[PDB]
Structure 1
Amino acid sequence: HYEEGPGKNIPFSVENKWRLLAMMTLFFGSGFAAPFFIVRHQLLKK
């Protein structure tokens, strides 16, 4: 069986709040950054 309870029903760890801050920052930041980098790619192509 699987682990149950607060912090165990999620595909990411909340054991260490600073490791968590890094994960959430890469997660949400990567989604927010992508359109900026796609626009850059298109402006750089020609």
Structure 2
Amino acid sequence: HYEEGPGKNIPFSVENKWRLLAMMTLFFGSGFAAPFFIVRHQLLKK
């Protein structure tokens, strides 16, 4: 089927902890920053 076992049953790579960090930082970082920008968006329309 597909790869099995630790670090293989996930849609992202954990082969590099640093790349992993960057991916996670973007993933969570993006979701957290969204409200802040939607607001800034709503303030800049009027």
Q: Where on the TM-score scale, by shorter chain, does this alignment land: which range?
A: over 0.9
The alignment yields a C-alpha RMSD, in angstroms, of 0.3
TM-score computed with the length of structure 2 as normaliser: 0.98
Flag structure 2 segments of 5+ consecutive residues without an equivalent: none
1:4-46: CA deviations, max 9, x gaps? 0000000000000000000000000000000000000000001
Flag structure 1 segments of 5+ consecutive residues without an equivalent: none
- Overall identity of the aligned pairs, in %: 100
